[PDB]
Amino acid sequence: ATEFTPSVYSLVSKPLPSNSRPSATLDEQAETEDLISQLFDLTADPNALVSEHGKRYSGLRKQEHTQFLASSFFQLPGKFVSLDASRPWLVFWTVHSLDLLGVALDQGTKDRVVSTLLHFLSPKGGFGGGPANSQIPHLLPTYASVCSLAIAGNDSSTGGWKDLAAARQSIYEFFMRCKRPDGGFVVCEGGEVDVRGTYCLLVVATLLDIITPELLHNVDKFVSACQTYEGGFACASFPFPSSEPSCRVSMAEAHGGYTSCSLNSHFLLTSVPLPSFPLSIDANAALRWTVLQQGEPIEGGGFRGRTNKLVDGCYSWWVGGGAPVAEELVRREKSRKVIPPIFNRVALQEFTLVAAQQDPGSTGGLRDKPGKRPDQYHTCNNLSGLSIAQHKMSHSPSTVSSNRLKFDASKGLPAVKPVAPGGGWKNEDERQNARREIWANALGWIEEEGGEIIVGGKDNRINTTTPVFNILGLRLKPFINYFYCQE
Amino acid sequence: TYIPMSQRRSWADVKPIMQDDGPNPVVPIMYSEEYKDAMDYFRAIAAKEEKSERALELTEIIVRMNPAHYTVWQYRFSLLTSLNKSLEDELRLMNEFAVQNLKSYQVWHHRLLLLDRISPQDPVSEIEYIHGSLLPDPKNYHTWAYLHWLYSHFSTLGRISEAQWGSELDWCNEMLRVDGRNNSAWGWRWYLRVSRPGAETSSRSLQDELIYILKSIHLIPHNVSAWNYLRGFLKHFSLPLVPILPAILPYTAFPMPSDPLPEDTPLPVPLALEYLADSFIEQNRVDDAAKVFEKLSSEYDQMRAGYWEFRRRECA
Ligand SMILES: CCCC[C@H]1CN(c2cccc(OC(F)(F)F)c2)C(=O)CN1Cc1cncn1Cc1ccc(Cl)cc1
Ligand SMILES: CC(C)=CCC/C(C)=C/CC/C(C)=C/COP(=O)(O)OP(=O)(O)O
Ligand SMILES: O=S(=O)(O)C[C@H](O)CNC1CCCCC1
Ligand SMILES: O=S(=O)(O)C[C@H](O)CNC1CCCCC1
Ligand SMILES: O=S(=O)(O)C[C@H](O)CNC1CCCCC1
Ligand SMILES: [Zn+2]
């Protein structure tokens, strides 16, 4: 299973060549190469049968990482006030990381998570980054809060899911107030427009059964025009006029974080049965860009976030986790005109184990690179990317077919009332067909039998996350089943 | 020593409102006294929807302590417009925030809203400021995106002159001269020369662009930025790969490479091999393309062994 995933220790490590042309980019690159390669040199090869004497052991220090996260359920120092508008992300990074690490929260602690998040929910729609009496709703905390309730909540009267169900119409109305005619969304009232907002909104709308035609109009075009000449995606596209722009232009360079959001957004839109929708992307170019961002052996096989910048553990999720999505879109196009791993699944795990863990006997946590303090965000995204590398994920047409066969369209929550009179589905046949396709495809990701690769032995294995959503399948399935009234 | 706001004459009429977290919230932050006090009074101000100079001062206090506080930024902008405050003064305050390393998505977006609402007849002063601001971080993603927005928005209003576009390319060329590995500046060149609606597309411009690309590759043969721009260029304009193959072939072992290549240029260059393979595919010579992909997979670009094997299998 590893003929095409060579270990970093089995390859010749050499610096990026200079061509006798120094520059600031190269100064930083060469210095980072020295940092990462020296730590690998001090660390026993994880693929060895008996670990080498005198060298650091690279096993995943799961209990250290659990202790690092435990601060969240007590308190954070004052110097992190810079995250005061991102407290739902602190929740999500913590509780998804604990899921990945296989550590259960007791029910009292889960109830505190639910109650805290429901205090962030505004009656007129959406979650803010903090208490609703202090912060206005925002698309990004709304994703983080919804996913956190999937991880920590339940279907009882104190489980928070019933409050989410009652909030569906107001959340939908918030989403529509955010919508621009060109297909972008502002992230909050008076806020910025970019594909992070589109991604967070489409995930939540998919999960809560609040997708309508008026919500989606031009969203596919906004996202598609974010693709750059490099094949990844920028943060946003600009509509040149004369809802009906004459053309759209990408506004910055291809980036791992916006490429993840764009690929995931486009993938969610391919489930929607609208005519000539979604506008296509160049999937081949996106797959090429993805694999080109995995670093060389001298930089430990981690991913960079853009061309000629530095590798960073959090892109294991943003770029590594986009790979199965790009792969599936390529597969669809190859068939529509009518297998070895697509990135180095082994090298990415070696980067996680050797370079991205905090040094042993310390605070625990995972980090960007050696020399950087660990934090909750890099802990979550290193582990989410590690999961994608360990477990071969694919979107299964036969699984989607089986999902269609078991869907019960007579069961469901009340249809959302559209803002504009003609903004809904044409009739029940069309709305129910949309619900079926969107639910059945959201539940189409599988781990492939016999595709597992656990570098360093089975004690390093973590749980399997879902591509696009980034929560465990065992969380996604009962959560989305709740809102669609399936069982 | 700090003076609490409860003991300030200017605030005596305001009853502060505490943060409503519930009794025992998760992820609590141990706030300083100054920050909690200011937010206590902001909650009261926002509750009564007060638009005032003291509210404006209070928002500045808060965003200095937390520049990522999007709610307080939103309230600040509505104070500016509601009170008809000088937006040029506010723009000078934002210049200082950058100096003192107060930065976020929210500050950059505040600057954009100011420029949109001021709507200057000529944005040249803001363009020059953005250029200067890039010297501490020449790859700042927010800054490059903002520069794209500024030219796109004001060109839609007809306010970017041909002289202004010309000096923007001059500046872009200088950025790439100082660091040819700055992929952000390569992205900007693409906007200036290819993607912006007003760009020229002629036989001359295509020839010039190809000359600049090939010269850049010959200067730095291992620069991924230049290879990606070349591939995007040819693909965007549906131009054949084969006629250019003479300039690329020396890296697989119009401007041509140096007769002795620069020192520290080990061969082959993997993206040159990708060029050769794709040019074989263009010639319908799938077996030759497959052999190049096989060598990329097993010897020359082994980190991507599986991707290059995928490419090999497509051809066989
Ligand atoms: C210890 C804080 C980590 C900061 C990190 C992530 N973070 C952020 C904050 C809130 C929500 C959020 O949402 C998420 F879902 F996590 F993205 C992200 C920032 O604001 C800047 N970050 C610096 C960075 C570290 N490694 C790469 N970066 C660049 C970068 C990443 C993401 C973003 Cl959005 C902006 C810049
Ligand atoms: C759903 C959601 C919130 C997605 C966002 C994911 C993400 C990683 C966004 C990054 C945005 C950005 C401008 C990064 C560059 O910052 P940088 O210059 O500090 O780092 P770099 O050198 O690695 O590019
Ligand atoms: O997260 S891990 O690295 O797996 C766990 C910590 O190293 C615990 N270290 C040992 C605990 C038992 C006694 C001897 C030390
Ligand atoms: O949903 S509604 O209750 O009508 C409107 C919001 O909840 C009010 N929250 C405000 C956020 C910013 C600080 C002041 C309070
Ligand atoms: O299941 S297997 O992959 O065959 C082998 C085990 O997982 C090895 N895990 C180590 C055991 C000794 C302590 C450090 C971890
Ligand atoms: Zn990072």
Q: Is the CB of A62 under 6 A from ligand 3?
A: yes
Taking the CA of residue A231 as centre, how many other CA atoms within 13 Å lie in the half-sphere pointing to its CB?
25
Distance from CA of A248 to the nearest CA of B (A): 9
What residues have CB less than 8 Å from A327, skipping those under 6 apart?
A287, A342, A394
A309 tagged catalytic: yes
Q: How far is B48 from chain A (nearest CA, A)?
A: 12
Minimum CA–CA partner of B42 in chain A: A134
Q: Which atom of ligand 2 is nearest to the CA of A304?
A: 23
For residue A417, give how far its alpha carbon lies from the nearest alpha carbon of chain B (Å).
Answer: 28
Amino acid of residue A168: R
| Residue of B66, B112, B186 with shortest CB distance to A84 | B66
Q: Who contacts B220 (Cβ-Cβ below 8 Å, separation ≥6)?
A: A19, A21, B180, B181, B226
What is the DSSP code string of B94-138? HHHHHHTT---HHHHHHHHHHHHHH--S--HHHHHHHHHHTTT-T
B110 contacts B70 by C-beta, under 8 angstroms: no
Return the DSSP state at A8.
Answer: G
The answer to whether the CB of A317 falls within 8 A of the CB of A53 is no
Beta carbons of A256 and A318 less than 8 angstroms apart: yes
How far is residue A442 CA from its own chain's centroid? 14
Number of the ligand closest to the Cα of A63: 3
Residue whose C-alpha is closest to residue B188's, from B201, B206, B170, B204: B170
Residues in chain B: 316
Q: In this complex, is the C-beta atom of A424 within 8 Å of any C-beta atom belonging to chain B?
A: no
Q: Is B203 helix (H, G, I), strand (E, B) or coil?
A: helix
The rounded distance, in Å, linking the Cα atoms of B35 and B171 is 42
Number of CB pairs < 8 Å for A and B?
Answer: 240
Q: Which residues 120-159 in chain B show a CB within 8 A of chain A?
A: 138-139, 141, 144-145, 148-149, 152-153, 156
B229/A contact by beta carbon, under 8 A: yes
Nearest C-alpha to atom 32 of ligand 1 is from which residue? Answer: A257
Q: What contacts 24+ positions apart, CB below 8 Å, involve A156-165?
A: A158/A111, A158/A114, A159/A114, A160/A114, A160/A115, A160/A117, A160/A118, A161/A479, A161/A482, A161/A483, A163/A118, A163/A121, A164/A208, A164/A483, A165/A208, A165/A413, A165/A482, A165/A483
φ/ψ of residue A56, rounded to 5: -65, 140
Q: Supply angle C-alpha A475, A476, A480, rounded to 5.
A: 125
B90 contacts: CB under 8 Å, gap ≥ 6:
B80, B114
Of B37, B47, B44, the closest CA to residue B17 belongs to B44
Helix (H, G, I), strand (E, B) or coil at B165: helix
How many A from CA of B57 to the centre of ligand 4? 21
Q: How was this structure determined?
A: X-ray
User: Considering only CA atoms, which of B138, B228, B125, B222 is closest in space to residue B176?
Assistant: B138
The ligand 5 atom at the shortest distance from the C-alpha of residue A460 is 7
Strand-pairing partners, residue B24, are: none
Query: Are A62 and A30 contacting, i.e. CB atoms less than 8 angstroms apart?
Result: no
Q: Is the dihedral of CA A331, A333, A336, A337 positive or negative?
A: negative
Contact B156 A134 (CB under 8 A): no
The tokens describing B25, both together, are 């919230």
Alpha-carbon gap, residue A131 to A100, rounded angstroms: 28
The residues spanned by each domain of chain B are 1-316
Where are chain A's structural domains? 1-487
Among the atoms of ligand 1, which is closest to the Cα of residue A140?
A: 13
Beta bridge mates, A472: A465
Nearest by CB to residue B179, choosing from A25, A75, A295, is A25
Q: Rounded to whole angstroms, how far apart are CA atoms A175 and A166?
A: 16
Measured distance CA(B36)–CA(B5) in Å, rounded: 11
Please state, in angstroms and rounded to a whole number, the distance separating the CA atoms of residues A62 and A358.
Answer: 11
Q: Which residues contact A375 (CB under 8 A, 6 or more apart)?
A: A365, A367
Positions of E strands within A187-290: 237-240, 247-250
SS3 A294: strand
Q: CA separation (Å) from A351 to A312, A366, A367, A386? A: 10, 11, 11, 9
A186 in reach of chain B (CB within 8 A): no
What is the bridge-based pairing of β-strands A393-395 and A247-250?
unpaired
CA of A360 to the centre of ligand 3 (A): 9
Among B18, B20, B24, B27, which would you mutate to test the A interface (most chain A Cβ atoms within 10 Å of its Cβ)? B27
Q: Quick one: A421 exposed, middle or buried, by C-beta within 10 A (0-12, 13-18, 19+)? A: exposed
Per the listing, tokens 């097993």 go with B298
Does the beta carbon of A458 sit less than 6 angstroms from any atom of ligand 5? yes
List b or e across B163-189, with b for residues whose CB sees 16 or more CB atoms inside 10 angstroms: ebbeebeebbeebbeebbbbbbbbbbb
SS3 content of chain A, % helix, strand, coil (to 5): 50, 5, 45
Structural tokens at position A337: 């005109």
Q: Is A378 annotated as a binding residue?
A: yes
Task: List, as ranges, residues 295-334 from A with C-beta within 8 Å of B.
Answer: 295-297, 301, 306-309
What tokens were used for A84? 């005061």
List B residues 17-56 in contact with A (Cβ-Cβ < 8 A): 17, 19-22, 24-32, 35, 39, 42-43, 47
Contact A395, A324 (CB under 8 A): yes
**Catalytic annotation, pick one of A368, A475, A482, A484:** A368
User: Does the beta-carbon distance from B222 to A90 stay under 8 Å?
Assistant: no
Distance CA A347, CA A426 (A): 50
Distance of CA A385 to the CA centre of its chain: 9
**Cβ contact B200:B244 at 8 Å:** no
**Cβ-count burial of A56 within 10 angstroms (0-12 exposed, 13-18 middle, 19+ buried)?**
middle
Given resolution (angstroms): 1.9
Helical (H) or strand (E) element with A330: helix A323-337
Protein residue whose Cα sits closest to atom 15 of ligand 3: A361
Q: Which residue out of A51, A60, A63, A98 has the highest number of ligand 3 atoms within 8 Å of its CB and is therefore the one to mutate?
A: A63
Phi/psi of residue A35, each to 5°?
-60, -50
Query: Is the minimum distance from the CB of A199 to ligand 2 under 6 angstroms?
Result: yes
DSSP H or E run through A394: strand A393-395
Q: Which residues of B touch A3 (CB under 8 A)?
A: 305
What number of other Cβ atoms are within 10 A of residue B135's Cβ?
A: 7
Coil, strand or helix at A44: coil
CB A403 within 8 A of CB A366: no
Task: Name the residue among B71, B121, B129, B61 with its Cα closest to residue B99.
Answer: B129
Q: Could you tell me which of B240, B239, B193 has the C-alpha nearest to residue B216?
A: B193
Contact A346, A453 (CB under 8 A): yes
| Backbone region of residue B101 per phi and psi (left: phi > 0; alpha: psi in -120 to 50; beta: other values) | left
Helices (H) and strands (E) in chain B, counts: 15, 0
Answer whether A193's CB lies under 8 Å from A222's CB: no
Which residue out of A87, A375, A482, A484 is catalytically annotated? A375
Residue partners of B146: CB distance under 8 A and separation at least 6: B108, B111, B112, B130
Q: Packing angle between helix A139-152 and helix A168-178, nearest 10 degrees?
A: 150
Q: Which ligand is nearest to the CA of A201?
A: 2
Q: Please report the sign of the dihedral spanned by the C-alpha atoms of residue A278, residue A280, residue A284, residue A290.
A: negative
* Residue in A367, A373, A377 to alter for ligand 1 test, most ligand atoms within 8 A of Cβ: A377
